[PDB]
Design a protein around this ligand. Structure first.
Ligand SMILES: *[B-](O)(O)[C@H](C)NC(=O)c1c(F)cccc1F
Ligand SMILES: *[B-](O)(O)[C@H](C)NC(=O)c1c(F)cccc1F
Ligand SMILES: [Cl-]
Ligand SMILES: [Cl-]
Ligand SMILES: [Cl-]
Ligand SMILES: [Cl-]
Ligand SMILES: [Cl-]
Ligand SMILES: [Cl-]
Ligand SMILES: [Cl-]
Ligand SMILES: [Cl-]
Ligand SMILES: [Cl-]
Ligand SMILES: [Cl-]
Ligand SMILES: [Cl-]
Ligand SMILES: [Cl-]
Ligand SMILES: [Cl-]
Ligand SMILES: [Cl-]
Ligand SMILES: [Cl-]
Ligand SMILES: [Cl-]
Ligand SMILES: [Cl-]
Ligand SMILES: [Cl-]
Ligand SMILES: [Cl-]
Ligand SMILES: [Cl-]
Ligand SMILES: [Cl-]
Ligand SMILES: [Cl-]
Ligand SMILES: [Cl-]
Ligand SMILES: [Cl-]
Ligand SMILES: [Cl-]
Ligand SMILES: [Cl-]
Ligand SMILES: [Cl-]
Ligand SMILES: [Cl-]
Ligand SMILES: [Cl-]
Ligand SMILES: [Cl-]
Ligand SMILES: [Cl-]
Ligand SMILES: [Cl-]
Ligand SMILES: [Cl-]
Ligand code: NA
Ligand code: NA
Lengths: 472, 476
């Protein structure tokens, strides 16, 4: 008889010939066994591409585990995962709104190891077996923005923490206006406002700039396990052309939280043969995906995404349920797809990341505040439930700017050092309030240029610069 | 022995002569009972309120009243609901610490009031009677700040037919008469905005312009305030609508919000409902004196706006705090307003459902500043706990009713950009066809909203209007 265990060695079940925990851990055990048998049999790369061969090797892995005498060690923490099960059972109903039963997926990951400590597969496996933590793929919407746009622009030294971006009206190449909610745009805006409010236009110019600088955006995303088939898409940074599991996407956030270092997500740490020989064991392959300056600058922006409360009530929800816990150093980001079909809230302290999705299995609209309110309230309860079952697991550490970060005094108005600039004839002495801007390059921000923001048409600049000029 | 009872007859305390009932409840109810006996004794003796103006006569009648209750056979019936009041004492004891924000021990006052009677069902008098006896529900007077706005500014203007729900006001930079800018936090202003936005964000300049309009129309603003029992010594103050020159108890202020919530009909606050002598003489009994302060159309339009103050969550996390503690209660029909004095010395949050109004203030006894989020967050979280404690003790007390527009309300189709009906306007030579998005705007007059004219907003300079009209013609 084979057995699957929790991280401490406690048997989950034995395998032979009714919850997520079983089928998820079994499924991944079987994946690891498949790689092992394919390697053991020296099956070539090209054979493994053949579908009849996959079927055979999948069936062999299943049988091997039924018939072998394997001990399979998972990353799962029995008390935590258990408390998450109870949390979804007790508080799942918070997610229901006008729109039918709202399904849900959550993944609690260790930021230092990528191990998964526990998860919510859905509202109630007995009613609905689909696994919303591991199998469901949905656009991550604006939770894309920190990873693929802003993070990468900072890492490449093309922007800093208080850099300015255009949220002026602009159209996609088809002539349609880029929209956010029901707004065509406003004007210039700091990266912090862009992120707190989740505006779309800033993210659109950010990606566009990366593309014009020839930046290897695919390299970044692939080092995190992301598979995006087409990068040549205007709305990519807003979630367009991307679909991900909660498990994979929680790994993107783990990378930001873990100071820019990726660790591959996993639920199985080891498989042992009857005799004791290691058939599979998880090997740490940390990767510095974003520089420490970049990750830690982003941690600071993401802390404010939550404390500003603009697109999620979370910090308020949690404060009411557990004010001590609410004082941990939470950072995060919300997502909402275009018709409110899917909501995401990703949360991290320095120790842990908690990814969260909700939506309907057949992809129809949630209520309008499903993500802003319902999901945030639910997650605050989940997060409390994890705390009760494992009271120091969240930790009390703060995120903190790496020493390699560079600090620049810049004009609040331009995101850039004070300077002479040419404004149509007349050269101006650009003056006004300064802020500390954080950069992940060598030299900090540049001097103020005419084209000071990320994005913006001529007209936009004319407009922005006349108010700047207006207040000197 | 005289006796002070809860509303149901349970004895709060007996009153004897002192040698030569350690709580806010005791002193508060005795203090009002004595005032009631004072009025009765002065009348019984037939003393004029030119005589009652003389200060030895006051002293005499106060001393007389105390002894009357000390030595007499009096049953005093309070309005205090025991199980509710007791839950509120437990709530401030258990959750009071949520208020301490680094600036010291933060003091607190609350009053729960029945909107259809003015009866005070319970109150919190401070953090802990034993530690500090100042009664922060009944005695303490502080500026109500921006919770002044709905009563003294927007509600009167709507009542007077001078604005409706989607009317536009100037938040453009303007100065006080002394030349200093009118500030809101660190902002010197923005541009035009709807009433609802003005209310959600609590901006100052729209409120200044609103009261200036009432003055210019010679509205009897004092008449309104005084019918709700407010005593403001000086109305000629530019910052009155923002709370400049007004100081109120929590108990009085709750009564103003009880007016708005009860469809514009005031009932005077009271904690004493009846005093009888052992011999049958009913010395005092509370008489209902309804006063229609705002029209029902005004009060119900105001309710709609204050619903959104809370649910927008701009100046208070209350609806979020409460959702997490009790989602079912959070779905009751909450309306309300926040206030913050200019150095964060005093935070107010006023809450209603159709049945009840709960007033709340926090600050320090010496008036120093709280932290910056004390009102936005700490007070809102504290009060969600309080509201929830009050519910658990009396599960139906908040009610499931909804606020709703009175059928006398007048609905108008207006431009979102102007708050006024679509049509032609003269913009500097060019007569222009004003077109665009419309909303339904609610009024409390006969004929609804006017046609758009050049000066479409409450407030604004020539410059401001140039700039807003400039913006409007790029749409069309
Ligand atoms: B974001 O706050 O989730 C914002 C609403 N993002 C989007 O608009 C967006 C998607 F969620 C998915 C594809 C494209 C897109 F612009
Ligand atoms: B309001 O949101 O409380 C707003 C801040 N009000 C004021 O600034 C204000 C006062 F609270 C008191 C007197 C004047 C004044 F402008
Ligand atoms: Cl499970
Ligand atoms: Cl375990
Ligand atoms: Cl790429
Ligand atoms: Cl992926
Ligand atoms: Cl490409
Ligand atoms: Cl795994
Ligand atoms: Cl680094
Ligand atoms: Cl916070
Ligand atoms: Cl909130
Ligand atoms: Cl469905
Ligand atoms: Cl909880
Ligand atoms: Cl830091
Ligand atoms: Cl510098
Ligand atoms: Cl550099
Ligand atoms: Cl230009
Ligand atoms: Cl242009
Ligand atoms: Cl008391
Ligand atoms: Cl009672
Ligand atoms: Cl002044
Ligand atoms: Cl007056
Ligand atoms: Cl008063
Ligand atoms: Cl006057
Ligand atoms: Cl009384
Ligand atoms: Cl008698
Ligand atoms: Cl009426
Ligand atoms: Cl709400
Ligand atoms: Cl509570
Ligand atoms: Cl209604
Ligand atoms: Cl009508
Ligand atoms: Cl009409
Ligand atoms: Cl009229
Ligand atoms: Cl003008
Ligand atoms: Cl002017
Ligand atoms: Na969002
Ligand atoms: Na306020």
């Amino acid at each position: 008889i084979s057995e699957i265990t929790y991280s401490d060695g406690t048997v989950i079940a034995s395998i032979e010939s009714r919850d997520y925990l079983y089928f998820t851990t079994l499924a991944e055990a079987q994946e690891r066994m498949y790689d092992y048998l394919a390697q053991r049999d020296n099956v070539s790369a090209k054979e493994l591409k053949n579908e009849a061969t996959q079927k055979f090797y999948r069936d062999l892995a299943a049988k091997e585990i039924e018939n072998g005498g394997y001990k399979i060690t998972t990353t799962i923490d029995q008390k935590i995962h258990s408390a998450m099960q109870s949390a979804v059972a007790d508080y799942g109903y918070l997610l229901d709104d006008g729109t039918g039963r709202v399904e849900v997926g959550n993944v609690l990951m260790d930021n230092q190891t990528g191990a998964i400590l526990g998860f919510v597969g859905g509202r109630n496996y007995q009613e609905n077996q689909n696994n919303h933590a591991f199998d469901t793929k949905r656009s991550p919407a604006s939770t894309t923005k920190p990873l693929l746009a802003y993070g990468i622009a900072i890492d490449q030294g093309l922007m800093g923490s208080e850099t300015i971006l255009s949220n002026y009206p602009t159209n996609f190449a088809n002539g349609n206006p880029i929209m956010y909610a029901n707004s065509k745009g406003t004007g210039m805006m700091t990266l912090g406002e862009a992120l707190n409010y989740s505006w779309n236009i800033p993210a659109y110019w950010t990606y566009r700039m990366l593309r014009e600088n020839g930046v290897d955006v695919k390299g970044y995303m692939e080092k995190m396990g992301y598979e995006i088939p087409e990068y040549g898409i205007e709305s990519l940074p807003m979630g367009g052309g991307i679909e991900v599991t909660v498990a994979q996407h929680t790994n993107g956030y783990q990378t930001l939280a873990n100071n820019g270092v990726y660790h591959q997500k996993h639920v199985i740490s080891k498989i042992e043969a009857a005799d004791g020989r290691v058939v599979y064991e998880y090997q740490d392959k940390p990767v510095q995906v974003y520089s420490k300056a970049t990750a830690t600058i982003m941690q600071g922006l993401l802390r404010e995404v939550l404390s500003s409360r603009v697109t999620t009530t979370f910090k308020s929800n949690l404060t009411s349920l557990n004010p001590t816990l609410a004082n941990a150093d939470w950072i995060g980001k919300t997502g909402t797809t275009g018709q409110d079909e899917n909501m995401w809230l990703m949360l991290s302290t320095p120790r842990l990341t908690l990814g969260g999705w909700i939506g309907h299995d057949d992809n129809h609209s949630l209520s309008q505040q499903a993500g802003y309110s319902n999901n945030s309230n639910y997650m605050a309860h989940l997060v409390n439930a994890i705390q009760q079952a494992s009271p120091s697991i969240w930790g009390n550490e703060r995120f903190a700017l790496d020493p390699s970060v560079v600090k620049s005094e810049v004009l609040k108005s331009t995101g850039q050092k004070p300077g002479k600039v040419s404004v149509e004839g007349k050269e101006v002495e650009v003056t006004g309030s300064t802020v500390t801007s954080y950069w992940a390059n060598k030299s900090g921000a540049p001097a103020t240029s005419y084209r000071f923001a990320i994005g913006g048409s001529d007209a936009d600049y004319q407009n922005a610069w006349s108010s700047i000029v207006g207040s000197l």
